[PDB]
Design brief:
homodimer; about 475 residues; FAD/NAD(P)-binding domain; 4-stranded mixed sheet; elongated; binds flavin-adenine dinucleotide; binds 4-androstene-3-17-dione; binds chloride ion
């Protein structure tokens, strides 16, 4: 992992101006910009093909500030409104400079993606869910239209989803229709790619400038020269057990990341040179129950208490559950509401969890669940008193979802229903320069995507990873191509 | 911050075998062992005198496994029992190797401190509080005798406190009577000290070995040669704003650390060489209300719900409040119980917070506090139903503290009552070698105390910082002195 001295490299197996490690969203975006800038670009990919986790993703791209898609669907937004939301939802300690920059450039970036051939359907999906069930292009994806954020920023949907039929998250998701047009764009520009390239270490000259990389390819060690810059775009550390334990131990035993090639190698390679890190504890957290069920009941913790409005982003529900409720949750829902939720339109019918317990009364359900006498009964009594007035003054679930819980009543066992992926990584500038602990860029070294700390510092919103990976991938390619 | 090449050092202003940066607990312990090993030892201290945060501390040292003090006070314990507690309380993702090692060596370490002249009174203080009000030597300090840990490990008090009169935490606390005998020990061994030494950067030779340091002293740059090793013992990053935002943003605006010299410089200096980090998000969190009041009421969050047993360690109350309850807490307590708690013996009478609201009924108190109708009333009704049977089945507060809340009833406003310090830092071996991201020690480089990730990975117990700082300080001095 220690840097290799350039003087010890006897021959270069490959050479380029800009060397991109990793052919996912950050890598392809970097390659497009570097090639447009006139640089000779070589992408090094560890597997046999392009796509990475990106090609398996739902396809959300977190964009706003007044995109043509938002306007076509009739949703106002501005860079200031977007920034206000993101600072509140994606912290604490979110990078204000980076978020401001991301927001100010968001409409341009949407247009840039469209220009590269990424298609979006100008239609909005408005029901609770993890993704649009159909080929709709816009959806709320961060809890913008739920408490607490709906009183902090004006709600605006920012989940932009490329148009694709038969989307299968985990196999060939909506993320594929982000990747494919970008790859086509890069290929037409003359971007070169080498596969089975497992990048291992950076090569530095005697000034400390990164001037290439060492990799294993087809069973042998190879050296690849980078005349202008190396872009690290190899993904996260989610599958590195040592790093999960040291940095993000809330994910021990509950991995959710898409691919095992996310082993943190590029983070470590850069740290070897003195590169800085940020928010290494930050984790996306999913909650594997269908949102159409969740929104029609109340979530209670292990003490039978409500703790989150049931109409917020289900990722936020995941974080609140894992982080603050010791991963213990139950959905309390009346039979009629369960039936309605189970019939509602969803992209994830396989997440329609069946109730574990069902009873004629809350008193019986409470005993059945092993909760102390009164713990659940009182929660439901207070909820129902206010819900009869369409009010949730405790958690501010929107009135449209608020009504008394009736009988018979059921409980879903949602203990241990979370899993997630890492959001922390290398510290980078808005120009995607990797920062040394000195606060200065490491010459020749750039990075984007989930090997970096991006817009998310703590909270997560769907689309922020493909969003910041593509946005800062562009910036890395521009910076790397400079002479 | 980048390392200085040894070839560029024209003259060494000072030279020693073992150079210790920082004259606090970790530094003095390292110096004693290095000097006993026969090494020429030089301590470099940034301020005009020794002590650091240690001399201002309460003086808890987290020790167990059957110390002579525990035995004299009639408390059984073992290294296995201590380890079981620490793994559960100080994680998630606590370093099992390090904790095991710390526990197996704990009795020897207590004896080692006694040999150096640290005095302990063989008496136990058994009442809730932040420290012993008198000169007692043993106290519960980690929640060992409260839920959930009292069902996971057999309760044993491990807060060992040096004997001292007129202890004043923040000025000259019990920690002074840990420091003073150790300093005397080091001086008699011939340990040398230089003051106004602000260490800035490490010096490395062409193999990457750390062979000295560069500092500013009395207005000028000086170089100090370390023939055998440099021990980093300069404290935490609590007062580095950039680092707090990047790594531990839950502490933004709520610093609790003792001294401003905790600016993370030694962490950064080591990272420049490729040193690894762990648990950079981990933070001790205090809660500035007297425990004798807390234990006699119920704590409720901003939704009027109980969330922590009121007889656990008040540091754990602090963490639960800040981390999981959005820093919002109120103490609900009847007038008679408040009077009893306010008269109870405490080291911190200045933390006897007065009630903000008081009412004849819970219904009125609830409205007064701006809580929704029923939110607090129901909490108290359920608590009281079980408390009339001496039972807290929701949070398992010990029965001795459980009884119904009566009337008149008061509420203390404990919103924004937390502050804390950082626990994350350099990754080190059990021999206090600083680890590179490669997993190999950086030659010549050792570290201990709050510039390192020690026994605590998340949870905190009082005494663990002086405990692991002195324990691993010893190990650093032993390792550094080796030829
Ligand atoms: C189920 C699921 C759904 C998701 N859907 C979304 C979504 O809709 N919107 C969103 O924003 N996020 C989503 N994500 C997250 C998103 O998929 C990833 O965070 C994002 O794709 C990472 O982008 P990247 O460019 O950093 O990595 P990748 O797209 O994974 O690309 C990294 C490339 O680097 C290669 N590589 C790894 N190591 C090396 C090496 N040593 N040498 C050379 N190459 C190497 C990998 O093989 C890979 O091809 C989802 C995650 C999951 C788990
Ligand atoms: C109110 C309060 C009470 C506490 N009480 C306890 C307790 O009872 N038990 C417990 O375990 N913990 C306690 N702590 C925490 C404990 O005080 C510290 O975590 C511990 O003293 C740190 O030990 P150290 O050796 O790393 O740092 P220190 O004891 O602070 O020593 C570090 C030394 O390094 C010097 N230094 C800094 N920078 C440089 C530099 N660049 N060059 C040269 N020297 C430098 C500093 O001046 C200092 O003298 C308490 C904290 C607070 C806030
Ligand atoms: C939250 C999420 C990841 C991060 C992101 O940005 C986009 C999505 C949408 C699809 C989610 C997924 C997490 C895992 C989910 C819950 C499933 O098991 C089926 C649907 C899927
Ligand atoms: C928790 C603590 C720090 C970490 C540690 O290990 C030992 C102590 C004991 C004294 C506490 C202090 C934190 C701040 C407290 C609450 C005060 O404001 C007065 C008493 C004091
Ligand atoms: Cl992923
Ligand atoms: Cl401190």
């Amino acid at each position: 992992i220690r840097p290799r001295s350039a003087t010890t490299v006897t021959e270069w197996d490959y050479e380029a101006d800009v060397v991109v490690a990793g052919y996912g969203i950050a890598g392809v975006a970097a390659s497009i910009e570097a090639a447009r800038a006139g640089a000779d670009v070589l992408v090094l990919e560890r597997t046999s093909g392009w796509g990475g986790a990106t090609a398996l993703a739902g396809g959300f791209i977190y964009l706003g500030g007044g995109t043509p898609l938002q306007k076509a669907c009739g949703f106002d937004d501005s860079p200031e409104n977007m920034k206000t939301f993101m600072m509140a939802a994606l912290g604490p300690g979110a990078d204000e400079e980076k978020i401001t920059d991301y927001c100010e450039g968001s409409v341009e970036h949407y247009n840039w993606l469209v220009d590269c051939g990424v298609p979006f359907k100008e239609s909005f999906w408005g029901e609770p869910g993890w993704e649009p069930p159909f080929d709709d292009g816009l959806m709320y994806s961060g809890g913008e239209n739920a408490a607490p954020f709906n009183e902090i920023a004006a709600p605006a949907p920012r989940g932009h989803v490329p148009q694709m039929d038969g989307k299968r998250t985990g196999e060939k998701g909506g993320g594929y229709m982000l990747m494919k047009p970008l790859v086509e764009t890069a290929e037409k520009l003359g971007v070169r790619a080498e596969y089975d390239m497992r990048v291992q270490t950076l090569v530095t000259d005697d000034t400390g400038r990164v001037v290439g990389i060492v990799a294993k390819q087809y069973g042998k060690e190879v050296a690849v020269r980078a005349r202008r810059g190396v872009v690290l775009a190899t993904g996260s550390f989610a599958y590195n057990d040592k790093m999960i334990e040291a940095h993000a131990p809330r994910l021990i035993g509950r991995p959710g990341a898409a691919i095992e090639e996310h082993d943190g190698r590029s983070i470590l390679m850069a740290q070897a040179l003195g590169a800085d890190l940020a928010h290494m504890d930050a984790t996306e957290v999913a909650f594997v129950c269908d949102p159409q069920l969740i929104v029609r009941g109340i979530l209670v913790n292990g003490r039978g208490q409500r703790y989150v409005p049931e109409d917020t982003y289900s990722g936020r529900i995941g974080q609140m559950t894992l982080f603050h409720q010791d991963n213990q949750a139950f959905l309390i829902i009346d039979e009629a509401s369960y039936e309605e939720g189970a019939a509602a339109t969803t992209a994830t019918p396989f997440l329609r969890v069946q109730p574990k317990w069902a009873a004629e009364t809350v008193e019986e359900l409470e005993s059945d669940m092993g909760l102390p006498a009164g713990a659940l009964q009182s929660t439901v009594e207070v909820y129902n008193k206010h819900a009869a007035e369409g009010s949730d003054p405790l958690l501010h679930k929107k009135s449209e979802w608020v009504k008394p819980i009736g009988t018979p009543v059921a409980a879903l066992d949602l203990r241990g229903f979370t899993l997630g992926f890492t959001l922390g990584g290398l510290r980078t500038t808005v120009n995607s320069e990797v920062l040394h602990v000195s606060g200065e860029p490491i010459p020749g070294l750039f990075a984007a995507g989930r090997c970096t700390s991006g817009v998310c510092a703590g909270g997560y919103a769907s689309g922020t990873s493909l969003g910041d990976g593509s946005f800062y991938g562009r910036r890395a390619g521009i910076s790397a191509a400079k002479q």
